[PDB]
Amino acid sequence: KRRISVKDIEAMKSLVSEEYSPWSNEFTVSQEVIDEFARLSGDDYWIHTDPVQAREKSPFGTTIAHGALVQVLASQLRIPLDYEVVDFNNMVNYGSDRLRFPTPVPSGCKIRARARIKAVEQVRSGVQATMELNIHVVGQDRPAVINDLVILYM
Template identity: 55%
Template sequence: MATLKPMPVATKISAPFWQALKENQLKIQQCNSCDGWVFYPRNHCTHCFAHDLQWKQISGEGVLYSYTLTRIPTMPEFSDEMPQALAVVELAQGVRINTTLIDVAEQDITIGMAVKPVFDKVSIDGETLLRFTSTENVGGVRDYIDPLKDLTRNDQGQVQVPVSNLTALSALADNKFTDWSNQIVVDQALINAFAELSGDDYWLHTDPERAKKESPFKTTIAHGSLVQVLQSRLTIALPFEIIGFKTMVNYGSNRLRFPAPVPAGSTIYGRSKVQDISVSHKGVQLTLEVHIHVVGSDKPSVINDLVILYR
C-alpha cells in the first residue's frame, strides 16, 4: 500500500541513508581522512574535500535548532498533519537535518530542546521517514497502520472507501492486480460487426483468406479499439468500492496501448490495479490500469490507464 504524499527519491549517493531508515537505523557519513561528519549525503567531505566517506550508524540524539508551524497545507495530501512542526535538528555530531517534529504540543516546543529520532513507517512496503520527538516521549519505530483495516465492507466483501478519506484512497494503490475476469471469445462475426459499425473494414481484420496468405499473423486480428471496448463486458472484481461522491465520470485515458494482437477466435480476459490517486480542483482522480490478455499469453493485448473522476 502506498501513500499519496510525495516521497523522497533515493539516488545512488543517498540510497544508503534511506535503506538504513527502513532498517530502523540512522546512518550518516563520516570522513576517514579528517573524521568530520557530513550531511546531506555527498561524494566528498565538506570539511577537507576528501573523497573518502563512510556510512556510520548514530543514535540520532540532538537538539532542536529551529522550527516553524504551518497551518495551511501546501498540498491537500498534507491536510491530516496540520499544524505541521517543520524543524531543523542539530545532531550530536554537529550536522543539521531538515525534518518534522511530532508528538509535541505547540506550547512545549522550545529551541534547544533535546530530541530523538522516530522511524515513521508510511507504507506497508516499509518506506520510512525520519521524524523527531522530545526525548521525554517514546521514540523508536512508529508502525504503519493500514487505513483500510477498520473500514466497513459491502455485501460483495468490497471495502468501502469514502472519497474524502485520502489516506485510505492512497492505500488502494498497492501495485497488486485483481483476479482475472470472465472470458470472452472474439470471433470473426464479432470483428465483422465492429468493422461495420466503425467503418474500419481493413482486410487485416475482415478478410480471412487474404490474411492467411499475406498477414504476418496468418489470420485476421481484432481491431485494438474493439478489444478495448470489450473491457466493458469483462467483469473485473475490484476489492474496493468508492462511496460518498456526487458524480463519477470516465475522464479518459492517460495511456492506451495495443502491445499484442488478438487473432480471430481468441479468448480474452482482463485484470486491473489502481495505479495512482491524485487530487485537484476538479476532484479526486483514480487511475485504473487495465490489462486485457489473450488467455494463455503473458503479454497484454491492451493496456489502458483509465482515469475516473469523482466529485
C-alpha cells in the same frame, strides 16, 4: 467489501498497488464481432476483415481484432475487486492517460482482463483515480491492450 470514502484522501491513496486483481470472466472475440465493429466504426482494414487473404499474407497467420475493438470490449469483462469506493456524488469515465496495443488478439480467441490502481490525485473537480487495465488473450502473459483509465470522482 471494504468501503473507501473519496473524502478520505489518504485512504484512496492506499489503494495504489502494484499487484493486479484476479482475472475477469472471458469473452470470445469472434470474426462476426470483428466484422460488425468494422462496419460500425468504418475501419475495414483487411488484416481484420479478410480471413482468406490474412491466412496467406498476414504476419499473424489469421485475422486479428481491431485494437480499439478489444479496448471497448472491456465492458464485457467484470473485474473482481475486494473494495468499493463511496461518498461521491458522481462517478465519471474521464478518458485515458495511456493506450497501447502490444500484441494482437487473433480472431476467435477469448480475452480477459485484470486491473490495479496506478495513481490517485486530488484535482479541482474531485479525485482522479487512474486504473491500469490489462486485457489479455486467455493464456497469454503479454497484454493485448493496455489502458490507463482515468476515473473522476465528484
